[PDB]
Design a protein around this ligand. Structure first.
Ligand SMILES: CCC1=C(C)/C(=C/C2=NC(=C\c3[nH]c(/C=C4\NC(=O)[C@H](C)[C@H]4CC)c(C)c3CCC(=O)O)/C(CCC(=O)O)=C2C)NC1=O
Ligand SMILES: CCC1=C(C)/C(=C/C2=NC(=C\c3[nH]c(/C=C4\NC(=O)[C@H](C)[C@H]4CC)c(C)c3CCC(=O)O)/C(CCC(=O)O)=C2C)NC1=O
Ligand SMILES: CCC1=C(C)/C(=C/C2=NC(=C\c3[nH]c(/C=C4\NC(=O)[C@H](C)[C@H]4CC)c(C)c3CCC(=O)O)/C(CCC(=O)O)=C2C)NC1=O
Ligand SMILES: CCC1=C(C)/C(=C/C2=NC(=C\c3[nH]c(/C=C4\NC(=O)[C@H](C)[C@H]4CC)c(C)c3CCC(=O)O)/C(CCC(=O)O)=C2C)NC1=O
Ligand SMILES: CCC1=C(C)/C(=C/C2=NC(=C\c3[nH]c(/C=C4\NC(=O)[C@H](C)[C@H]4CC)c(C)c3CCC(=O)O)/C(CCC(=O)O)=C2C)NC1=O
Ligand SMILES: CCC1=C(C)/C(=C/C2=NC(=C\c3[nH]c(/C=C4\NC(=O)[C@H](C)[C@H]4CC)c(C)c3CCC(=O)O)/C(CCC(=O)O)=C2C)NC1=O
Ligand SMILES: CCC1=C(C)/C(=C/C2=NC(=C\c3[nH]c(/C=C4\NC(=O)[C@H](C)[C@H]4CC)c(C)c3CCC(=O)O)/C(CCC(=O)O)=C2C)NC1=O
Ligand SMILES: CCC1=C(C)/C(=C/C2=NC(=C\c3[nH]c(/C=C4\NC(=O)[C@H](C)[C@H]4CC)c(C)c3CCC(=O)O)/C(CCC(=O)O)=C2C)NC1=O
Ligand SMILES: CCC1=C(C)/C(=C/C2=NC(=C\c3[nH]c(/C=C4\NC(=O)[C@H](C)[C@H]4CC)c(C)c3CCC(=O)O)/C(CCC(=O)O)=C2C)NC1=O
Ligand SMILES: CCC1=C(C)/C(=C/C2=NC(=C\c3[nH]c(/C=C4\NC(=O)[C@H](C)[C@H]4CC)c(C)c3CCC(=O)O)/C(CCC(=O)O)=C2C)NC1=O
Ligand SMILES: CCC1=C(C)/C(=C/C2=NC(=C\c3[nH]c(/C=C4\NC(=O)[C@H](C)[C@H]4CC)c(C)c3CCC(=O)O)/C(CCC(=O)O)=C2C)NC1=O
Lengths: 49, 172, 163, 172, 162, 162, 172, 162, 172, 162
C-alpha cells in the first residue's frame, strides 16, 4: 500500500504485471493493446456491447 | 471527489439549470449545521487509535481464527496490515463525514477492496465485521457530551452509521 | 472531481495519508461560515437571470457594434440567441462557484479547454469579458456587503481566465 | 510502424525471397509519383484548422444533443477533447498518407479507440460522422489547384478516402 | 514550521497561479481565530508551576514503581528534568496555540519522538498521562471556544504521543 | 523499420504535431533517391547466385584452414549453409536498398548478431570479408549513382560485423 | 523463495509447532550432502555455454523449421532470444539445485512463461524439447567423475532431472 | 526469507548471473555449520517448557506491577497469552538456527513488531527480559559453537526489540 | 571500500609482480587471526545499542549545552539525528574492523563530513569527543572474556582504538 | 575489489543495517577456506614460466595456422605478447586465489574483455584453450581442495571468455 492510492491501483498493477516471466513485449500476436481502458473509467462495473 | 455542494451542483448542471431555491435552502442548512459535523469529525480523528484498538480486540477475541498460526492475521506482519486497513477505512469514513457525501469513500477508498482481499485470500467477511466493530466503538466516542457544547446531532449519528454500513457492505 | 475548501483539505490529508488535524477543520469552519453570503448572493443572482443576460448581450453589441451586421458572427437570430445562451452559461457557473464557495465549477466546466474552444470556433474572449464586466457592474447594484465582494471575486476570476 | 516499402519487404522476408521484379516495379512507381503524395500531405497539414473547424461546425449543427447539457460534448473540457481527437485522427491520416500505409494509424489511434469511446460513453457513431465530415472538408482541400502544378491525383483521393473510412469503420 | 498561512504560501508556491479565493479564505479564518488563541495562550501562560507540578504528581501517582528505587523515575535530577520536560511540552503547546498551527509542535517535539524514546528508554505513557492532566486543568481554566482550541492542540500532542 | 519516411513520421509523431517543411523535405529526398537504389536492388537480385558463390569461395580462399577436417567449414552442410547465410546478408542488403534505410539490416541481422555469433563461434571475419568481396564485385556489377548506395549498405553491414 | 530449510520451517509453522526430530534429521542429511550438491551446481555453472550450445545444435538439427524464414527463431533477434531463454532456464535450474527446492522455478522462472509463449506464438512444444535436450546435455557434465572425489550422487541427478521436467511441463 | 542460500540466489539473480565461487564458498560455510545450528535447535526444542516458563517468571519478577490486578498482565488469559508469545519467540529462534539465518525472525517477529506493540500497548522491555532469561539458560544448555550461534539469534531478537 | 587482502593485490598489480611470500605470510596470519576478528566485530554489532546509549549518557553528562535551548541537540529531532549518526559511525567502524582497512570509513564519508559539520556550525570537537566515548564504551565491551574462548586480542583492541582515533581526527 | 569480506560489507551497508549473522557466516566460511587457497596460489606462483610456456605451446599446437607469416601469431613480438597475456591471466588467477574471490579476476580481465578482444581481433578461443592447458598442468602441479578452488577460478575465467 502506497500512501494516497485508490483501492483499484492494486488490482490495476496486478492486471499490468503478468508474472515474473512476462513482459511488455509488443511482439505479441495482439500488438500491445491497452489493459486498463475500462477499469479506469468504469472502475467497478462491467458492460457488454 | 464530491462534497454535498459539488453533488447538488452536478445534479443541477445535468438538468442544465440554476439551483432551485429549495436546494439553496438545503445547502444553507448544511452549512449552518456543519459546525456539528466538524465536531463529529474531530471526535473520530482524535479517538482513532482507541476505536481501532477496541475493534481489533473484539474482533480477535471473537475470532481466534485470525490470530492462530496459519490464520490470516497471524504472522505479525499481516497483523500490522490488519491494523493499517482499519486505520485507512476509518480515515475514509472521517473524510466522507466532513465532506457530506459517500463519494469520497466509495471512489477513493472501496471500489477494489472485495477483489483485492480475494486476491490476497483474506476473509472479506472478517473485514466487514471489523468495520462494524469500528462503527460500534466509534459511536460511543461520537456521542460524548464531555468537553463539547450540548446539542442534538442524531442526523450526524445516522450519517456516520450509514457511511460505516456502506463500507462494510461493499467490503463484504 | 471539483475543488472546495472541503475537497482541498480532504485531498491534501489523503495524500499524506492522515487524519484532519486542526488546520483542515479550521478551514472547513471558514467555508461553512462563509456559505451564508455566498449562497444568498447566488440566490440574488439567480433571481436576476433575464435582466443580467439580456443587458450583457446588449452591452457586447454596444461595445462591438460590427458584430451584428451580415457577414459577421453576431448576424442572425440563432447567433444572437445563442450569445444569450453562452452568457447564461457563464452566469450559471458563477452562481455555482458561489454556492460551492470555490472556483471548481468555473475551472472544470468553463475554464478548462476555454482557449482551444474559443479558437476552433473563432470566439473572441473580449466579447465575453465585456459581458462579464457588465454583469459585474450590475452585481454592484444588486448585492451589498460581502456577497457583492465574492460575486465580484468570482466574476474577476472568470475575466482573468479569459484574459 | 510501416510504409509501402517495408510492407512489401516484410511479405517477401516472411516468404523468404528477394523482392520480385513486379513488386520492385510497384515500389518504383510509388516513389516516382510520391511528389503528388507530398502535395496531398501538405494540403492536409496546412489547412488542418479549416478541416477541423468546418467538421465541428457541421457536426454540432446537425447533432445538437452533443452540445446540450448532459450531452457528451457539453463543457469546454469535453468540447476541447472532441476537437483534440478530431485533430489527432486527421494527423494520423496525414501520417498514413505520407507513408502510404495505414499501419501507423491502426497502431497509434485505432487499436484501442472503440473500446475507449465505449468506456467513456461517447457515441462512436457520432465520432465516425465527425471523421466523415473531416474527410469531406479535406477533399475540398486536396483538390485545390492553387499554388501547385496541374495534374491527376485520383489515386491519392481514393487512398485518403480509404484512410478516413478506415478510421470511421474502426471507431464505429 | 507549517502554520496555516505558512501552508497557504507553501501550497501556492508549488504551482503557477496566485493565492485564489480558497487560500485567502483559510488565512481569513485563521486571522479571526488567532486572537482567541492569543488570549488562550496568555491564560495558559499564567499557570506554568501549577500545571507542571499537578501533572508530575499525577504521573507519579499513576506509576508507583518509577518512584521506587532502581527505576528511572527515582532521583532529584530525574524529577527536575521531569519538570523541564513537562515545561517543554507546555511551552510548545503554547507556541502551537499562538501560531494557530501545529508547526511548532511537529518541529520541536513530535519530530524524532519515537527514536529518542527508544534510545533513552522513556515511556510515552508518563507523558500521555501528563497531557491528560493538562487537559483536565484546561477544562476548568479555559471556557468555551478558547477551551476547544486549546484542547485541540493538546489532544494533537496526545495523538502524536500515541 | 527505421527508414527516412518512418523516421520522419515517428519524429513528427512523438512531438505531437503535423508534418512541417523539413519532414516533407527529407521525404522528397528519399522519394527521388529511390530510383538508383531500386536499380541496385534489381542488379544484386539478378546477380545473386554468382555473388554468393564468389563470397563463399572468398571465405574459403582467405580462411583456408576453415575447410580442413575437424572444424567449422568441413562438410557439405556447413558449406550449403554458409551459402544460406551469405544469401541472407545479400537479401537484407537489397531490402535496405529498396527501403532506402538501414531498417532491415538493423532488424533482421544487426540486432542480436554478436550474441548468436558468440554462441555458435561463427567468426565475424568470415562474413566481414565475404561482404568485402561483394563490396568489390558491385564495383564491376554496378556503376554510377547506385554504386554509392550499394557500397553504403555493404559498408554498414561490414561495420556492424566489426 | 524457499530452500529446503525454509520450506520445512513453513510446514512446521502452519502446524504451529517446533520442528520435529525427523525433520531435523532430514535437514542434517541435506546439509551433509551439501558439498556434493555444490559440485553439481558448479558443474552446471561451469559448463553452461557448452550445454546451451549442444542443446541449440541438436534442437535445430532436429526441428529445422525453427530457422526457416517465417519460423519462430529465424532472424538474429529471436535466435538470441532462444539462446537467452535457454541460458535463463539453466540458470534457474542450477539455482533450484543449490537451494534444494523447486520454489524458485515457480516463483520466478515459470511465473508467466506459458502466457508469454502463447502471446508470442512461440511453439511451447519446441521450448520443452529444448529443455529436455538441455537436460540430456547437462547430465553428461554432472556425471563427470573427473576432478571430483568419486562417490554416489544419483539423488542429485534425479533432483536435477525432475527440475528440468518441471520446467518442461510448465512450458509445454 | 533471507537464508545464506536464498540471499545468494537473490543477489545472483538480480545481477542475472550464475553462482560463482564466492557464492558457493558462502554456501559451503553455511552447510558446514548447519550441524551446530541443528544441535542448538534440538536442545532449545527439547528444553521447551522449562525455557518458556522460566522466561515468563522472569518477566513477572522484573516487572512486579504487571501481575497486579486491574491492568495488563493480570488474568490467566494474559498469562497463557504471554506463554504463547514466548513460545513464538523461541520457535522462531530455533527456526533461525535451522535456517542458518535471520529469515524466520525477520519475516514473522521482527517485521511489523513495533506498530503492533504500540497498537496493543505491549512493552518491548517484557520481551527483552524474557529473551535475556532465555540467553542465560541457553548459556547453560549449550556449549561450544551451538552456544554462540544461539546467542547470536537471541540478541538479534533483543536488538530488534530495542 | 577495500580490504587488506585487496590492498596487497592492488600494490602487487601496481608493481606488476606476483604476490611475494612475505606478504603471503602476512595474509595467512591475518586469515588465521580472522577468527578473533569475527568475534570482535560480532561483539561490536551485538552491543551497539548498549554502547550508543552509554556514550550518549556520558556525553550529555559531560557536555550540557546540547540540552539548553539554542544548543545543537536541544530540538528533539536534532538529538535524534545525534543518536542516528553515532550509530552510523559505529556501523562503519565495525565494517573497518572486519575488513582491516581504515579507508572504508574515511574515503566513504569523512571527506564530506568535514565540510558538512563546518557548514552546519555544530561543535565538531563535540563529535570527535563522541567518537572517543564511542571507542571507550566499545573497548569496555570488547574485553568481555565471558561467552568467548579466552585468547590474545591486544592487537584487535589497538586496531579499534586507532580506527576510532582516525575517525575522530578526521572529524576533528 | 571484491572478496567475500567486501561483498559482506557492501550488502550490509546497502540495506543500512549492522553486520548480522548471515554475513558473519559468509566471512567465517571464507576465513576457514583461506589457507588452502593461499597454498594453491603459492604453488601457481612457483610455476609461472612453465605454465605460460606450456600454454603458448598449446595454443600453437591447437592453432597451427596462427604461426604462419601474415597472421597474428607471426613475429617474435607477438610471441612475447602471447607470453605476456598468458602470464597476466595466470597472475590474476593467483590474485583471485589469494583474495578468495573472483574480484581481481573480474575487474582486471573480465572488465571490458569483449570490447578489447574485438578491437585488436584477438580470439577468445586462444585464451580458452590456453586456460584449459593451465587446467591440465595444475591438475598435476597441485593437490587437495586446492585443486577444486583453483580449477573453479580457472573455469570462471574460461566462462568469462566463452
Ligand atoms: C486506500 C484504500 C486501500 C485499502 C483499504 C487497502 C487495503 C489493503 N490491505 C492489504 C493487505 C492486508 N490486509 C489485511 C487485513 C485483513 N486480514 C484479516 O482478515 C483482518 C480481519 C482484516 C483487516 C480488517 C491483511 C492480513 C493483509 C495482508 C495479506 C497478506 O499479506 O497475505 C493490501 C495489499 C497490500 C499489502 O500487502 O500491504 C491492500 C491493498 N488498500 C488501499 O489502497
Ligand atoms: C478548529 C476546529 C473547530 C471545531 C471542532 C469547532 C466546533 C464548534 N462547536 C460549536 C458548538 C456546538 N457543537 C455542537 C456538536 C455537539 N452536539 C452534541 O452535543 C455532540 C456532543 C456534539 C456533536 C455530535 C453543537 C450542537 C453546538 C451548538 C450549535 C447549536 O446547537 O446551535 C461551536 C460554536 C461555539 C462553541 O461552542 O465553541 C464551534 C465553533 N469549531 C472549530 O473551529
Ligand atoms: C461550459 C460553458 C460553454 C460555453 C461558454 C460555450 C461556448 C460555445 N460557443 C459556441 C459557438 C458560438 N458562439 C457564438 C457567440 C457569439 N454570438 C454573438 O451573438 C456574440 C457576439 C457572441 C457571444 C458574446 C457564436 C456566433 C457561435 C457560432 C460560431 C459558429 O459555429 O460558426 C460553441 C459551439 C457549439 C455551437 O456552435 O452551437 C460553444 C461550445 N459552450 C459551453 O458548453
Ligand atoms: C517541401 C515539400 C514539397 C512540396 C510541397 C512539393 C510539391 C511539388 N509538386 C510537384 C508537381 C505536382 N504536384 C501535383 C499535385 C497537384 N496537382 C493535382 O492536380 C492536384 C491539384 C494537386 C494534388 C492533389 C502534381 C499532379 C504534380 C505533377 C506530377 C509529377 O511531378 O510528375 C513538384 C515537382 C515539379 C513538377 O514536376 O511540376 C513538386 C516539387 N514537393 C516537395 O518536396
Ligand atoms: C525538544 C523537547 C525535548 C523532549 C520532549 C525531551 C525528552 C527527554 N527527556 C530526557 C531525560 C528524562 N526525562 C525524564 C522524565 C520522564 N521519566 C519519568 O518517569 C517522568 C514520569 C517522566 C516525566 C513526564 C527522565 C526520568 C529522564 C532521565 C533520563 C536521562 O538520564 O537523561 C531526555 C534525555 C536527554 C536530556 O534531556 O537530558 C530527552 C531527550 N527532550 C527534549 O529536549
Ligand atoms: C537473419 C539472417 C540469419 C543469419 C545471418 C544467420 C546466421 C547463422 N548461421 C548459423 C550456423 C552456421 N553458419 C556457419 C557459416 C560458415 N559456414 C562456412 O564454413 C563459412 C566459413 C562460414 C560462412 C561465411 C556455420 C559453419 C554454421 C554451423 C555452426 C554450428 O552449427 O555451430 C546459425 C545457427 C542456426 C543454424 O544454421 O543451424 C545462424 C543463426 N541466421 C539467420 O537467420
Ligand atoms: C523468468 C526469466 C524469463 C524467461 C524464461 C523469459 C522468456 C521470454 N522470451 C521472450 C522472447 C522469445 N523467446 C523465444 C524462445 C523459444 N522460441 C523457440 O523457438 C525456441 C525453443 C526458443 C528460441 C530461442 C523466442 C524465439 C523469442 C522471440 C519472440 C519474438 O521476438 O517474436 C520474451 C519476451 C518477448 C519480447 O522481447 O518482447 C520473454 C519474456 N523471459 C524472462 O525474463
Ligand atoms: C568453492 C566451492 C566448493 C565446492 C565446489 C566444494 C565441493 C566439495 N566436494 C567434496 C567431496 C565430494 N564431492 C562429491 C560429488 C561428486 N562426486 C562425483 O561422483 C559426482 C559426479 C559428483 C556429484 C555431482 C563427492 C561424492 C564427494 C565425496 C565426499 C562426500 O560424499 O560427501 C568436498 C569435501 C572434501 C573431500 O572429501 O574431498 C567438498 C568441500 N566445496 C566448496 O567450498
Ligand atoms: C508472529 C509472532 C507473534 C507475536 C510476537 C505476537 C504478539 C501478540 N500478543 C498479543 C496479545 C497480548 N500479549 C500480551 C503480553 C504478555 N502478556 C503478559 O502476561 C506478559 C507481561 C506479556 C509478555 C512478556 C498481552 C497482555 C496481550 C493481550 C493484550 C490485549 O488483549 O489488549 C497479540 C494480539 C492478539 C490477541 O488479542 O490475542 C499479538 C499480535 N503475535 C504473533 O502472531
Ligand atoms: C550515513 C552517513 C552520514 C553521516 C555520518 C551524516 C552526518 C550528518 N548529520 C546531519 C544532521 C545532525 N547531526 C547531528 C549530530 C551532532 N551534533 C551534536 O549534537 C553531536 C555531538 C553530534 C552527534 C554525533 C545533529 C545535532 C544534526 C542536526 C543538524 C540539523 O538538522 O540542522 C547531517 C545533515 C543532513 C542529514 O543527514 O540529516 C549530516 C550530513 N550524514 C550521513 O548521510
Ligand atoms: C557464528 C558466527 C561466528 C563467530 C562469532 C565465529 C568466531 C569463533 N571464535 C572461536 C574461538 C575464539 N574466540 C576468540 C575471541 C575471544 N577470545 C577472548 O579472548 C577475546 C576477549 C575475545 C575476542 C572478542 C578467540 C581468541 C578464540 C580462539 C582462537 C585462538 O586460538 O586464538 C571459534 C572456534 C571455537 C573454539 O575455539 O572452540 C570461532 C568459530 N565464527 C563464526 O562462524
Amino acid at each position: 500500500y502506497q500512501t494516497g492510492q485508490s483501492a483499484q491501483g492494486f488490482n490495476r498493477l496486478l492486471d499490468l504485471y503478468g508474472g515474473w516471466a512476462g513482459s511488455d513485449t509488443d511482439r505479441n500476436q495482439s500488438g500491445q493493446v491497452a489493459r486498463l481502458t475500462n477499469s479506469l473509467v468504469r472502475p467497478g462495473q462491467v458492460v457488454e456491447p | 471527489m464530491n462534497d454535498v455542494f459539488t453533488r447538488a451542483i452536478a445534479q443541477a448542471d445535468l438538468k442544465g439549470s440554476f439551483l432551485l431555491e429549495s436546494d439553496l435552502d438545503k445547502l444553507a442548512s448544511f452549512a449552518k449545521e456543519g459546525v456539528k459535523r466538524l465536531d463529529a469529525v474531530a471526535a473520530l480523528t482524535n479517538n482513532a487509535p482507541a476505536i481501532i484498538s477496541d475493534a481489533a480486540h473484539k474482533l480477535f477475541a471473537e475470532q481466534q481464527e485470525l490470530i492462530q498460526p496459519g490464520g490470516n492475521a497471524y504472522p505479525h506482519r499481516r497483523m500490522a496490515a490488519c491494523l493499517r486497513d482499519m486505520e485507512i477505512i476509518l480515515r475514509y469514513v472521517s473524510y466522507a463525514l466532513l465532506a457530506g457525501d459517500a463519494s469520497v469513500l466509495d471512489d477513493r477508498c472501496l471500489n477494489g477492496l472485495r477483489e483485492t482481499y480475494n486476491a490476497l485470500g483474506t476473509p472479506t467477511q472478517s473485514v466487514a465485521r471489523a468495520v462494524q466493530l469500528m462503527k460500534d466503538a466509534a459511536m460511543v466516542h461520537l456521542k460524548s457530551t464531555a468537553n463539547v457544547t450540548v446539542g442534538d446531532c442524531s442526523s450526524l449519528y445516522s450519517e456516520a452509521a450509514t457511511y460505516f454500513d456502506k463500507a462494510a457492505a461493499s467490503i463484504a | 472531481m471539483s475543488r472546495t475548501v472541503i475537497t482541498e483539505v480532504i485531498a491534501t490529508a489523503d495524500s499524506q495519508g492522515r487524519f484532519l488535524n486542526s488546520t483542515e477543520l479550521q478551514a472547513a469552519f471558514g467555508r461553512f461560515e462563509r456559505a451564508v453570503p455566498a449562497i444568498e448572493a447566488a440566490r440574488a443572482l439567480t433571481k436576476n437571470q433575464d435582466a443580467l443576460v439580456k443587458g450583457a448581450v446588449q452591452a457586447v453589441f454596444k461595445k462591438f457594434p460590427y458584430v451584428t451586421q451580415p457577414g459577421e458572427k453576431g448576424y442572425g437570430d440563432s447567433n444572437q440567441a445563442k450569445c444569450a445562451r453562452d452568457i447564461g452559461y457563464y452566469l450559471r457557473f458563477i452562481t455555482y462557484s458561489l454556492v460551492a464557495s470555490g472556483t471548481g465549477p468555473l475551472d472544470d466546466y468553463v475554464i478548462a479547454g476555454l482557449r482551444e474552444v474559443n479558437r476552433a470556433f473563432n470566439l473572441n474572449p473580449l466579447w465575453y469579458i465585456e459581458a462579464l464586466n457588465y454583469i459585474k457592474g450590475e452585481t454592484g447594484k444588486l448585492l451589498s456587503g460581502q456577497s457583492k465582494t465574492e460575486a465580484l471575486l468570482y466574476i474577476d476570476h472568470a475575466i482573468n481566465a479569459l484574459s
